[PDB]
Ligand binder design. Structure first.
Ligand SMILES: [Mg+2]
Length: 48
RNA sequence: CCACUGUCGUUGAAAAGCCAGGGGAUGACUUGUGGAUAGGGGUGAAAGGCUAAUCAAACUCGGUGAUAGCUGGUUCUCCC
């Protein structure tokens, strides 16, 4: 009933997603939270 | 036709040659043209040799984005 220009989802409704490997300042650069080179840091790795 | 020795050359004149020497040179000889044998198959006076500069299993395409506990890389910012 407002404008299309001024509706908001409200606080807590939306969270921005994490993007791994986008620099130092993001807290997820380089390894992207995977730590260092073991089986878990590799691509198709799982928790069997 | 071959390839024993050496020098040279080794981003070569050349992805195997040159030069100087060397061996066979009527023979199990060399060579032209066409054909046959096809990949775990061929062919081999046998070196795992050769099968188009590719051979302890050719090449191309496809399964296929094979798999890779391995290596590398992984991109804006500030606060706790
Ligand atoms: Mg060859």
């Amino acid at each position: 009933g407002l404008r299309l220009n001024e509706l908001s989802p409200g606080v807590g409704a939306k969270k921005t997603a994490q993007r791994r490997g986008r620099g130092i300042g993001s807290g997820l650069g380089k390894t992207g939270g995977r730590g260092v080179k073991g089986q878990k840091s590799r691509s198709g790795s799982s928790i069997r």
